Design an enzyme around this catalytic site. Structure first.
Site, PDB file in Angstrom:
ATOM      1  N   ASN A   1       7.079   4.622   3.752  1.00 50.57           N
ATOM      2  CA  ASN A   1       6.218   3.974   2.740  1.00 50.57           C
ATOM      3  C   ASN A   1       6.050   5.133   1.916  1.00 50.57           C
ATOM      4  OD1 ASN A   1       4.466   5.219   4.489  1.00 50.57           O
ATOM      5  ND2 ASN A   1       2.763   3.979   3.818  1.00 50.57           N
TER       6      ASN A   1
ATOM      7  N   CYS B   1       3.395   6.968   1.041  1.00 55.00           N
ATOM      8  CA  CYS B   1       2.756   7.898   1.655  1.00 55.00           C
ATOM      9  C   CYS B   1       3.234   8.749   2.969  1.00 55.00           C
ATOM     10  CB  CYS B   1       1.381   7.507   1.849  1.00 55.00           C
ATOM     11  SG  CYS B   1       0.676   7.012   0.153  1.00 55.00           S
TER      12      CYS B   1
ATOM     13  N   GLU C   1       3.538   7.469   6.286  1.00 54.25           N
ATOM     14  CA  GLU C   1       2.752   7.422   7.415  1.00 54.25           C
ATOM     15  C   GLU C   1       3.489   6.236   8.159  1.00 54.25           C
ATOM     16  OE1 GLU C   1       0.038   4.733   4.915  1.00 54.25           O
ATOM     17  OE2 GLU C   1       1.045   6.734   4.701  1.00 54.25           O
TER      18      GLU C   1
END
Ligand SMILES: Cc1cn([C@H]2C[C@H](O)[C@@H](COP(=O)(O)OP(=O)(O)OP(=O)(O)O)O2)c(=O)[nH]c1=O
Ligand SMILES: [Mg+2]
Length: 720
Positions: free
Chosen positions: A405, A407, A409
């Site tokens: 995604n 970011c 994670e």
């Protein structure tokens, strides 16, 4: 005799209960607040002038920020209705006064649950908890999280939290109240979308979406583009796997022409992100390094609303390290390289090589240094290890995972029919440290159980922007429980971040979360049955995340007994844990972000036209109580970019404790990530801080992360 210099001092003094009066001095605020002048001024301008004045003294002691917040909150309280049910009613009955149209700010269904139980719900709320934010965390709430009528806040922080709780738990009043208490006491927070939209019509409760490009065709490309634009409508971050699109100059059968490649395609995606920003959309574009457009991709950002990431196979890394050649391919000549990983990738890729289906051969190290040159300038692309992501994913049985995604994670399965969704919350790790310097692991677990149950209920209430998102979520029910304030927990335990005491606490914290999470996810499976794609998954075969890392947990928790529970009942959720960046929610609860150490011991916040200097509050307490703190020292700390390491008068124990992230070994950082990573069934958002970039040093950080087994080797690179 003139006088009247106290009077207002008393008003400030009234709200200093429990603050450190050795450093807090109300008279100091009044000296600036007076100069209040005016004949036509009243009890509203000071409160806001005293709150601002107190807030600038945060640099003398942290309790000034607590005092600034009390002033600002008690002021908000007198410009707000007390009763919760009455604020919800006014939020619903809102007539937008200049379009004429009834424009309810809460959902009728929410308000009806509220009015049906107003006595219990109104009285469950404890408004003194609004006084538990510091000034800057309160101004963040006031800016974005409290519903406004007229451009005048109608929701107290308590009212917002109770809406969120009722929004999630609906007619379950017991649950709603429990979640209210956990949130208002700050034991955890839901992610920003949930705080904005629960209880409203349009409950877009999720944080990020993941897409795979539909197929390699104008048709395919523009379905996906549409999907992205619809998701961007609803508070969406996006990750997009783009490796199946054919390279520049590749043959197009139907127009007897040549593909234009990735770049001009991505120009369109970039402008769609600029265009659909609720009215600041960001897409992360994931590429595998065998794709023939890799060099042009690593050179573009040098596309401002796109963020770039490599989805890297082990083979590329081996080829770089053993100084062999690297074959660049067009996915239309060499299909399915993105549908397959590990051995099966290496064999199919090798087989295209033996067939001479290769569009360009370069030295693996030429590409390697194009990558790190890219990272030096922009700090991108993000480095993800495809094979680690897949090898250790409980969604394995679904197929190959093509991307993460925005970011980094979230590692979840995506496809033509499925858009993956991130349903997120975080635990406030600092809150679990006892007043006796021990860590309350049993409370942590019990709170994580509640978060799991809430994230499951959110999956079921969420408004999905496209039906492929909804399908994804209901089939596998993944959830992403992260943390915040790890650095703060260490400091409250008096552990240097790199100490052996922290390294063990770090492992135990995350054993505990994974344990509780699994325990609640298994209890929910008992009540409702395993998620639909559970039979086949590594967990259905008795394999938990740590087994995939070949790690043996500590003695802290009985894993044997949980495995028996899971073997019998299954689990409700395909995935449970993902430490996300927590940028906005950490700033509200006043913790440091996520798993990250303090980047600096002195930093500024903006609050509208205000600029405020903040000292690490743990540090500033230590410096003030040892009679060491004065202005000439603050300025030395600024002059050393937030470091206290060369200030001779600070004792070495505090120097160990307050190392900035620049001064902490990134190798240790990456190591602790791998160590907690064995109990994180998704990934974690992990920045690398290297003071001044050195190509050799960066290569060495990357290979260390890769060899440690990390799914995410690097989110952003930061140099200062
Ligand atoms: C038509 C067109 C395609 N392309 C690229 C984007 C797609 O990834 C790729 C294929 O587009 P397609 O629209 O699939 O072209 P096609 O129907 O001829 O399919 P094929 O060649 O597979 O038989 O070509 C361009 O760059 N510019 C164009 O004008
Ligand atoms: Mg075609």
């Amino acid at each position: 005799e003139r006088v009247m210099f106290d009077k207002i001092t008393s008003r400030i003094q009234k709200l200093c209960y429990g603050l450190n009066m050795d450093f807090v001095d109300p008279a100091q605020i009044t000296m600036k607040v007076i100069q209040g002048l005016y004949s036509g001024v009243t009890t509203v301008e000071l409160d806001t002038l005293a709150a601002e004045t107190a807030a600038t003294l945060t640099t003398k002691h942290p309790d000034y920020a607590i005092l600034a917040a009390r002033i600002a909150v008690s002021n908000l309280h007198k410009e707000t209705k007390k009763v919760f049910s009455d604020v919800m009613e006014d939020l619903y009955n809102y007539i937008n006064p200049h379009n004429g149209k009834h424009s309810p700010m809460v959902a009728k269904s929410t308000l009806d649950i509220v009015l049906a139980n107003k006595d219990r719900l109104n009285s469950a709320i404890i408004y003194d908890r609004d006084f538990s934010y510091n000034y800057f965390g309160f101004k963040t709430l006031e800016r974005s999280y409290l519903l406004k009528i007229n451009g005048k806040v109608a929701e107290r922080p308590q009212h917002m939290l109770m809406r969120v709780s009722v929004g999630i738990h609906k007619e379950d009043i017991d649950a709603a109240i429990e979640t209210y208490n956990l949130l208002s006491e700050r034991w955890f927070t839901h992610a920003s979308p949930t705080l904005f939209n629960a209880g409203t019509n349009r409950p877009q409760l999720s944080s990020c979406f993941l897409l795979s490009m539909k197929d390699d065709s104008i048709e395919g490309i523009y379905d996906t583009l549409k999907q992205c634009a619809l998701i961007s409508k609803s508070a969406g971050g996006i990750g997009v796997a783009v490796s199946c699109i054919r390279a520049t100059g590749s043959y197009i059968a139907g127009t007897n022409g040549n593909s234009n490649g990735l770049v001009p395609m991505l120009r369109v995606y970039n402008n769609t992100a600029r265009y659909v920003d609720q009215g600041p959309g960001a897409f992360a574009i994931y590429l595998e390094p065998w794709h023939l457009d890799i060099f042009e991709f690593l050179d573009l950002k040098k596309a401002r609303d796109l963020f770039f990431a490599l989805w890297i196979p082990d083979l590329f890394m081996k080829r770089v390290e053993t100084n062999q050649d690297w074959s660049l391919m067009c996915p239309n000549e060499c299909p399915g390289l993105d549908e397959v990983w590990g051995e099966e990738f290496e064999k199919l890729y090798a087989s295209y090589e033996k067939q001479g289906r290769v569009r360009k051969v370069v030295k693996a190290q030429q590409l390697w240094y194009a990558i790190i040159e890219s990272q030096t300038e922009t700090g991108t692309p993000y480095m993800l290890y495809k094979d680690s992501c897949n090898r250790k994913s409980n969604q394995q049985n679904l197929g190959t995972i093509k991307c993460s995604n925005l970011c980094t994670e979230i590692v979840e399965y995506t496809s033509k029919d499925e858009v993956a969704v991130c349903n997120l919350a975080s635990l406030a790790l600092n809150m679990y440290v006892t007043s006796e310097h021990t860590y309350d692991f049993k409370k942590l677990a019990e709170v994580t159980k509640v978060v799991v149950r809430n994230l499951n209920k959110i999956i079921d209430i969420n408004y999905y922007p496209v039906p492929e998102a909804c399908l994804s979520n209901k089939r596998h029910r993944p959830i992403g429980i992260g943390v915040q304030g790890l650095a703060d927990a260490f400091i409250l335990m008096r552990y240097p971040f790199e100490s052996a005491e922290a390294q063990l606490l770090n492992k135990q914290i995350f054993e505990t979360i994974y344990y509780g999470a699994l325990e609640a996810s298994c209890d929910l499976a008992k009540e409702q049955g395993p998620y639909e794609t559970y039979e086949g998954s590594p967990v259905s075969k008795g394999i938990l995340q740590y087994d995939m890392w070949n790690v043996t947990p500590t003695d802290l928790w009985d894993w044997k007994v949980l495995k028996e529970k899971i073997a019998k009942y299954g689990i409700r959720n395909s995935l449970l844990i993902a430490p996300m960046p927590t940028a906005s929610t950490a700033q509200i609860l006043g913790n440091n972000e996520s798993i990250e150490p303090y980047t600096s011991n002195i930093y500024t916040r903006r609050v509208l036209s205000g600029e405020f200097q903040i000292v690490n509050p743990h540090l500033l307490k230590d410096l003030t109580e040892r009679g060491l703190w004065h202005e000439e020292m603050k300025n030395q700390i600024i002059a050393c970019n937030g470091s206290i390491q060369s200030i001779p008068e600070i004792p070495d124990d505090l120097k160990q404790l307050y190392k900035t992230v620049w001064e902490i070994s990134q190798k240790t950082v990456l190591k602790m990530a791998a160590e907690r990573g064995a109990f994180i069934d998704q990934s974690q958002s992990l920045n690398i801080h290297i003071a001044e970039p050195n190509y050799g040093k960066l290569t060495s950080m990357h290979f260390y992360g890769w060899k440690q087994g990390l799914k995410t080797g690097m989110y952003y690179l930061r140099t200062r």
